[PDB]
Amino acid sequence: SDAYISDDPIQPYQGNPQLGNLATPINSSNLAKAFINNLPAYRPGLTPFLRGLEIGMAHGYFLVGPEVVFGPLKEGSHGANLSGLITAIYITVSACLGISIFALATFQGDPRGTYNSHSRDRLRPLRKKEDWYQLSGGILMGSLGGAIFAYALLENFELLDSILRGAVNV
Amino acid sequence: VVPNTVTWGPNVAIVMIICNLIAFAIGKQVIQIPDAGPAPGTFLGLGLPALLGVTSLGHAIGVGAILGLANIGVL
Amino acid sequence: DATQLEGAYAAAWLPWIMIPMITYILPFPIFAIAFLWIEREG
Amino acid sequence: MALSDSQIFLALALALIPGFLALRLATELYK
Amino acid sequence: SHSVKIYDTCIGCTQCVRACPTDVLEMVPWDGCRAGQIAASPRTEDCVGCKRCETACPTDFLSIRVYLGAETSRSMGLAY
Amino acid sequence: ATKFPKFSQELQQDPTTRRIFYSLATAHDFESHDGMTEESLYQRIFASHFGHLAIIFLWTSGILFHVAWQGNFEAWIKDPLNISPIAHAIWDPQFGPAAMDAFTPAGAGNPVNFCYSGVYHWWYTIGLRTNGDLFAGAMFLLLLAAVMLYAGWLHLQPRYRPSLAWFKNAESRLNHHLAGLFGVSSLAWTGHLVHVAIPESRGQHVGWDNFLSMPPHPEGLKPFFTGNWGAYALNPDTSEHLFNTSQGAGTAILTFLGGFHPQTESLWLTDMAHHHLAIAVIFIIAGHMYRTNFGIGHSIKEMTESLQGPGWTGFFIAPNTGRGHKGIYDAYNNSLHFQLGWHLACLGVVTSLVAQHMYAMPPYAFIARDYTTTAALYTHHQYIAGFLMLGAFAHGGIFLIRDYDPVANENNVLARVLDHKEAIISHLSWVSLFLGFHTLALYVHNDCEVAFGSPDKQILVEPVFAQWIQAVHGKALYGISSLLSNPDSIASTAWPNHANVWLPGWLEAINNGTNSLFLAIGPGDFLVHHAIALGLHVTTLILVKGALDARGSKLMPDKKDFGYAFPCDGPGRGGTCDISAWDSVYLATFWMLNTLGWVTFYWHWKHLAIWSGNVAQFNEGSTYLMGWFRDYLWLNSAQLINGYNPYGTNNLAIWAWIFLFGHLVWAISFMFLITWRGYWQELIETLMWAHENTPLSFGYPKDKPVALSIVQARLVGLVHFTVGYIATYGAFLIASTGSRFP
Numbered sequence A: 001s002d003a004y005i006s007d008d009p010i011q012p013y014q015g016n017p018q019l020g021n022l023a024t025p026i027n028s029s030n031l032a033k034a035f036i037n038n039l040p041a042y043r044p045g046l047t048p049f050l051r052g053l054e055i056g057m058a059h060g061y062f063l064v065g066p067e068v069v070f071g072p073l074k075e076g077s078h079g080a081n082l083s084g085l086i087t088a089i090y091i092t093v094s095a096c097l098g099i100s101i102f103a104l105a106t107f108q109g110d111p112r113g114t115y116n117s118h119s120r121d122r123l124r125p126l127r128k129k130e131d132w133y134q135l136s137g138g139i140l141m142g143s144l145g146g147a148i149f150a151y152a153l154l155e156n157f158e159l160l161d162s163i164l165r166g167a168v169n170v
Numbered sequence B: 001v002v003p004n005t006v007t008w009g010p011n012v013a014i015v016m017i018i019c020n021l022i023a024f025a026i027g028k029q030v031i032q033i034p035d036a037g038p039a040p041g042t043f044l045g046l047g048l049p050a051l052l053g054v055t056s057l058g059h060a061i062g063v064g065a066i067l068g069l070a071n072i073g074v075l
Numbered sequence C: 001d002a003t004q005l006e007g008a009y010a011a012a013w014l015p016w017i018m019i020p021m022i023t024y025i026l027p028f029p030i031f032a033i034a035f036l037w038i039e040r041e042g
Numbered sequence D: 001m002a003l004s005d006s007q008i009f010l011a012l013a014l015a016l017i018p019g020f021l022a023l024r025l026a027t028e029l030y031k
Numbered sequence E: 001s002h003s004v005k006i007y008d009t010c011i012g013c014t015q016c017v018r019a020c021p022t023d024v025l026e027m028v029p030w031d032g033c034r035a036g037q038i039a040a041s042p043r044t045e046d047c048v049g050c051k052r053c054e055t056a057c058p059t060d061f062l063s064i065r066v067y068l069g070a071e072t073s074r075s076m077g078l079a080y
Numbered sequence F: 001a002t003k004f005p006k007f008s009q010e011l012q013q014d015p016t017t018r019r020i021f022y023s024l025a026t027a028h029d030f031e032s033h034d035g036m037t038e039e040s041l042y043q044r045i046f047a048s049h050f051g052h053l054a055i056i057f058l059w060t061s062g063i064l065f066h067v068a069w070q071g072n073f074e075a076w077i078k079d080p081l082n083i084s085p086i087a088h089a090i091w092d093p094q095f096g097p098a099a100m101d102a103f104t105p106a107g108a109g110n111p112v113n114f115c116y117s118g119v120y121h122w123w124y125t126i127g128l129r130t131n132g133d134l135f136a137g138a139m140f141l142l143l144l145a146a147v148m149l150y151a152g153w154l155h156l157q158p159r160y161r162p163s164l165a166w167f168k169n170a171e172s173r174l175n176h177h178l179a180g181l182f183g184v185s186s187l188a189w190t191g192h193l194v195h196v197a198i199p200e201s202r203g204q205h206v207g208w209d210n211f212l213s214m215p216p217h218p219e220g221l222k223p224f225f226t227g228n229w230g231a232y233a234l235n236p237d238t239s240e241h242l243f244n245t246s247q248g249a250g251t252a253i254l255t256f257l258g259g260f261h262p263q264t265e266s267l268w269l270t271d272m273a274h275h276h277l278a279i280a281v282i283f284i285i286a287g288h289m290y291r292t293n294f295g296i297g298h299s300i301k302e303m304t305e306s307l308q309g310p311g312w313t314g315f316f317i318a319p320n321t322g323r324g325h326k327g328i329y330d331a332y333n334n335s336l337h338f339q340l341g342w343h344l345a346c347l348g349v350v351t352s353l354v355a356q357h358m359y360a361m362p363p364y365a366f367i368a369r370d371y372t373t374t375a376a377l378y379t380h381h382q383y384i385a386g387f388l389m390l391g392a393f394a395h396g397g398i399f400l401i402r403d404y405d406p407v408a409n410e411n412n413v414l415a416r417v418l419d420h421k422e423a424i425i426s427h428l429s430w431v432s433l434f435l436g437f438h439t440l441a442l443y444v445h446n447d448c449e450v451a452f453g454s455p456d457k458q459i460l461v462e463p464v465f466a467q468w469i470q471a472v473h474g475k476a477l478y479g480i481s482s483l484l485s486n487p488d489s490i491a492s493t494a495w496p497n498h499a500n501v502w503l504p505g506w507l508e509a510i511n512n513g514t515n516s517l518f519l520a521i522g523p524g525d526f527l528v529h530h531a532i533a534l535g536l537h538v539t540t541l542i543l544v545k546g547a548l549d550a551r552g553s554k555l556m557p558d559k560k561d562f563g564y565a566f567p568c569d570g571p572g573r574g575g576t577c578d579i580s581a582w583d584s585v586y587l588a589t590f591w592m593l594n595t596l597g598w599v600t601f602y603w604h605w606k607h608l609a610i611w612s613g614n615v616a617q618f619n620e621g622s623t624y625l626m627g628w629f630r631d632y633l634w635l636n637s638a639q640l641i642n643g644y645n646p647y648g649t650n651n652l653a654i655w656a657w658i659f660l661f662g663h664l665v666w667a668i669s670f671m672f673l674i675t676w677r678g679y680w681q682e683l684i685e686t687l688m689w690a691h692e693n694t695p696l697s698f699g700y701p702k703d704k705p706v707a708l709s710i711v712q713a714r715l716v717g718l719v720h721f722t723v724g725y726i727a728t729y730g731a732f733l734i735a736s737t738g739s740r741f742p
Ligand code: F6C
Pocket: C028, C029, C031, C032, F687, F690, F691, F694, F696, F697, F698, F699, F700
């Protein structure tokens, strides 16, 4: 009687009510889609290396901080920044080893699940193993670089502080 | 310490009546009015249930308004 | 006396980060977003 | 007396309501 | 593209057609004036908007009007 | 085809860089937008108004927040004559320590900006005493801006978009704006003035914690209900009352003293509360004139359509006006450009009134002694008013282009002024020519007399009519015993009534030769008033000519078919440059800027000579033009241009930099204003050749580089001329006053 006869804010996913999802404002509004679809994972046209490079830069940058503030070396500035840098380095190398072995194990013949050729998953667009290896290399490069950029900004915090206060104009 | 509160004088009966008439003015816009029971609509539109409800809300509004005006000097 | 920028006001660390964000960190992303908005095709 | 840090952070958090209301009105007026 | 409109005060003097640098205008038979001709503007996608046709018109007011409209790469006169 | 702009398919097909520039300057012209109905137009304008009010509230909230966080409001209320109010803090990382020291005052620990907007005086006159009060007001305005934003978003929803008949309701809106936007709001402001502003002026603190406790008067709403209203005007503030303190205080809340508080040199707060009450009552009355849906009331349309003909039931003060005002109601109500150009003229007259009244009758405590604030506020509102008056005639022209119906307005007043428009334009031309020839020739004669060593041979004409109007108000400065100057005159005594209880207070102020209320005027004032007359007349000539010739002239009969803004009609018929009606608002912006320059130059020099004590500098130096050049521009520049020199920097360094910045922008304007399009298009063609033939230059323009169009560059050069003209004079007026009178 009322089952999809009135027009509500929550629609079937892709107009298909037998799919296992709903079109809610968090996965289907113009603001949510404009943000998510333009994130490097989903931005149209990008090569996998550039996607991974930007993901890594953003990720290695913030991963330095938790150990700088909370780590065992936090009582001293230099050691805290070094502990944060090597924590970001280790998490990056572990995550990229995982990306590489995911691609190695998944793409064997026709893969199973979302990377099978018949899959309709819109949220997982890296369908080839070449995409995954280019992504792994890019995430590694970008994340190690973003980690050492955050490390270099934290090491020179005394200089960056005197600069942003105009103390260098004497 | 306590919110003043006056006794009862012609000034208190005026506020309690002007607030009972505002209740009548706004209680004409209710639904299911003149609901028989007793005197089905023999109170200028309202029945006896609607008159009692309007005057009960008017007494409530009157007690609130009178104690507020007595607290702040006006009454 | 004043060898550097100071704030004698509450949360005086906020100009230190707000002026970079508003003026030379977030503007080129905003310019890129607006450029991609005005150059997108039908 | 002068404002506190919490009074500045209250301002910063409370201006997120006109900040996202303005974005909602801007996208409702359809560029 | 610009809009070039020709009105019935035309006298078929051909001067608008001769003055057009981009060949927008031509003469068509009319029997509405004694020259037997009236201007027409079919290739108005070529119109740049120089209004040489309007300068060449002798009638008061002009029997040909150019209304500058949507700019294309042809009406902007761009060789790049 | 791009997707931008979404409001114009013709600009999406545009393959050049013109569509980006034309999508920015046609974005708010909703009428000429793709698939725009009248109803959708009104609804979009409604939501845009709401977003605009949100911006205004956010701006005021930010001003309040920065005075409460980075100003010295609590430190300034202790001594509002020897402490400079602070706007906000500087966080320029590029300063040297010499500029950090220069912008740091004695009582501050960081570089700051000195506030010249007058908000300290205004907030101090209305009760605000602490930074917590300012922060509470700022947070209220932040939330109120959020409310306006939500209202604007809400009325774009389909169940909430108003109908077109709602927007056309010109009887309900006038009733609710007169009584409820002007009346109830002014009644609430009187309520604040007697509950917060006057008590805090006497020393008692009233807040949102004890205002229900504290009564505004010792007999709380006893005199009002009983009918004895004269009790509220008893025991006012004495002459030796010190503001914000109870020494000399009174108890009256509504009194009509007149003149000024002798210690703040400002209007009395009892007078302003009584004013806003007598305004609120009259406006609440006036918002009961037109009928909405209760039978009683007038109809505006029936009142206007009844002014057709002769007789006492008809339009009798001009019986030869044909159809009179028939169709004038529909011309007003249907055309949004008629309304906007009408309301802009009303607002531009009110803004000039604001400027002309707030220096002569200062309403805020100790703002007459903040000289730079007074000058900045007057110049600010007079330039805003000149722009509003320019846009009034702009939209009067746009109405005659877009919305004017010659058959609905057949032979009425509007179509009757369009008929004889050459008489109006030629008589504005005659007044302009007469004023210009005579004023310039009088000034040049005075120049040649003073240069040849004869200041005594100058033609010095006294403004005897304005000196007499100064006398009819009670000025004894001259030998004219006129109306209120004559103490036992019919006007002074109010013979049957004797109820002008404003007369002694007002004559204590007009005769006081230290305020700005009716300043003394002499021969140098007459000439500059005639220059102001010339300026307003020529600006009106340009705007009236372009509005009345908007629909067509003899050089271009069908000008209404080409729009409001269009470049030209080619080089035929001798040439038709600047022929559109938009080009008249273009050409009159220069004349508005020049006229307001003359106005503000006059005001500033008059007041600088008064404030310095050397009033004879303006008196015997403003009758010839080298005195204006040398004793005003050259002389009051020495502190500004020394804001930074090879020896150091003071706090006038930014005003020197902005002075030069405005000179630069004004000069850049002349590039767009003198050089025209084809030069730059050929230059850009050579640049396109150079770019396609250079190695390693992998970028390529997605949209073809073209020179700015004719109307576009007219607008760009005019915007530059305006911005540089405002920046130069704003930097000079703040620094020539803030240095002489810190
Ligand atoms: C990218 C793209 C591109 C490229 C590539 O790629 C280019 C290049 C060229 C070459 C070839 C040459 C040489 C170089 C030089 O020396 O000089 C410099 C300049 C510049 C500008 C430089 C440039 C560079 C680039 C831009 C880089 C980039 C940067 C970043 C990216 C930014 C950032 C972004 C964000 C987002 C903001 C040129 C030039 C010229 N331009 Mg030209 N470009 C271009 C762009 C542009 C634009 C937009 C405009 C407008 C403004 C123009 C303009 C111009 C003019 C006027 C001229 C001239 O004068 C010149 C010539 O001709 O010679 C002869 N043009 N170039």
